Each structure stands twice: as C-alpha cells, then as structure tokens.
Amino acid sequence: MRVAVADVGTNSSHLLIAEALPGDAGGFRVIDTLKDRTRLGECLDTRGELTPEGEERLASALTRFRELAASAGAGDVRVYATSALREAPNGAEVAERVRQRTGLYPAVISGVREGELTYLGVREAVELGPDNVLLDLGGGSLEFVRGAEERAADVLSLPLGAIRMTRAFPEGDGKNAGRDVADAVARQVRELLRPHAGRFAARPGTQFFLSSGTAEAAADAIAQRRGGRPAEAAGGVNGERFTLTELADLLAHVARLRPAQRARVPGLERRGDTILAALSVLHAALDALGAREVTVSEGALREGMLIEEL
Ligand code: NA
C-alpha cells in the first residue's frame, strides 16, 4: 500500500514515498521525502540546453530514486519534470534518454498542469475556502490558480520565474541596481497580466495562498523580522501568514543589499542569487490582484501528484 512520486525541478529533485490508506476515507501518510541536489541549473548551456553532465546527474537521481522506492515496497515511481526540462530545447530528448538508461520517464508537464496539481498539494496542506487564488512561483514560471475547496477552476502560467527574471533583468553594479531590477520585474509582471484582468483579482472573501521555495523563504524571513525563531526551530512555515506590507518591507530591505548580503538575511539563505527578482515577482503579482494577506503552504506539486494517484 505504498506509492512513490517524484518531481525534477531545476536545482533539486525530490522523491516522496507515502502509504496509501484504506480507500474508504482514503488519504495518505508521508513515509519519507528524499532530496537529490541535481543542480540542473548549472548544467544548462548558453542556449539553455541540458549538458551531458546534466543528463548524467538526472539519470543518477532517477536510478537512486527508483531503488529507494523499490526497497521501500512502493513499486513504480511517477516522475514529473517542471521548468528546467520544460524550457530546455532538448528537454524531451533528455527525458527519453533518461528513460532508456533508468527505466523511469521524467514526464515534462506544462506550467498549467503543474499549477493544477500544486493546488491539490496546497489543499491538503492549508485550509482552502470558497474562493482561493494561489500563486506558485518556480524557477521558470509563475502559476496563477483560482478555485474553491476541492480543485482548480482556472489556471494561468506566465514566464515570470525567479531564475528567469533574475536572468532577464541583470543587476548592475550601482547602488540602485536592486531597486531598478525590482521595478523592471514589477513592470514585466503587470504587462503579462494585462491581457488577464479580473481572472485572479480579489473579490470579497477571496483568500490568497503561496507555495514553493521563494514564498517559504519569504515567510521565514518575515517571521524572523517580527522577532521569531528560524523556521527550522519552529517546525516549518506551513500555514504562516504575512501581509503585503510585510512583503514590501522585506523586498525594500533586499533591494538595498548586494547578492552576497541577501544570502545573509535570515530566512533567505540559499536564495541570495534570485531572491530579489523573486520577491519582486510575488509583490507585484499580489499587489496587482489586490491581495492584502497570504497564507503559505508547504504542500505543492509532489503532494498534488499523490492526491491524483490516489
Ligand atoms: Na511555478
């Protein structure tokens, strides 16, 4: 009664092993989550194609994942790949070669598919209401999801990822370069949402949610800026809330710092390279939709994959 799902991201891949409960009430219990530091982001060439060293790291990850699942009695791993392989021009070729080498097929899912599954992961992590808007900021893309208590009704994927924006708007040496990038990213967010007014905008009673790593880091940083302990000592950030004003203040702080300093802001360790652009995406998007406050969900794509499998 054990199931395994995995996602291939940009710099990390994760295997989730869960026990599937009696179908009557159903549900799942997470047995293990195993990370692989695939680091595909540093294995992308100038045209964005995955290098042979990237194929090797990916093949190595999926081989180890397959063994972990099999030794745990979980049978076969469903594997979905997101922005890294989606945007690589040779992503489909890499996926078929990895399948030939490992027997696992990393299916490259669309941004919208990722968003609809992530919404399921959020559903089982935090309490959804009758009108929810979810923003899931990844490396290449930002997914907007709207729905009710059960599933996504509307999904939009826009090319506003933390890595993609960091690259699209290179930061200069000047003291104002962080602010200038933040402003340019915000103008790009509004421009790509311009065809889509009303779709994800706050209505009375709309509740807003965030998922994935930037948002979790933001919640950790904001809580510690209110005097809290690091999330690692407080059991994580799932369910934490923060206001748009708190996000704006964290962004203004980050923008006046240089990249190396950003990685020393508590909560933002391991995200100094993209946190400026990523916070700029989140604030600009939330502001444009009229969000006042958000809840952060540690559940996301992998949990959603489980829910669909069950
Ligand atoms: Na995303």
Numbering used by the authors: 1 to 310
Reproduce text from the manuscript describing this model.
Degradation of polyP into phosphate is involved in phosphorus cycling, and exopolyphosphatase (PPX) is the key enzyme for polyP degradation in bacteria. The PPX hydrolyzes and releases the Pi progressively from the linear polyP chain. Bacterial PPXs share conserved catalytic domains 1 and 2 belonging to the catalytic N‐domain, and most members of the PPX family contain two additional domains 3 and 4 in the C‐terminal. The exopolyphosphatase belongs to the ASKHA (Acetate and Sugar Kinases, Hsp70, Actin) superfamily protein, which utilizes a common fold for binding and catalyzing hydrolysis of ATP phosphoanhydride.
We determined the crystal structure of the N‐terminal domain of DrPPX. Superposition of apo‐ and NTD structures of DrPPX revealed that truncation of the C‐terminal led to an enlargement of the cleft between domain 1 and domain 2 of the N‐terminal. This suggested that the C‐terminal probably exerted a force on the N‐terminal active regions. The result indicated that C‐terminal domains might “pushed” domain 1 toward domain 2, which was consistent with the comparison of apo DrPPX and NTD crystal structures. The root‐mean‐square fluctuation (RMSF) values of residues in domain 1 (1–120 AA) of the NTD were higher than those of apo DrPPX, indicating that residues in domain 1 of the NTD tend to be more unstable, which may affect polyP binding and catalysis. Moreover, the NTD of DrPPX exhibited a substantially decreased enzymatic activity compared to that of full‐length DrPPX. Compared with the NTD, the CoM distance between the loops in the binding pockets of WT, −5AA, and −8AA gradually decreased.
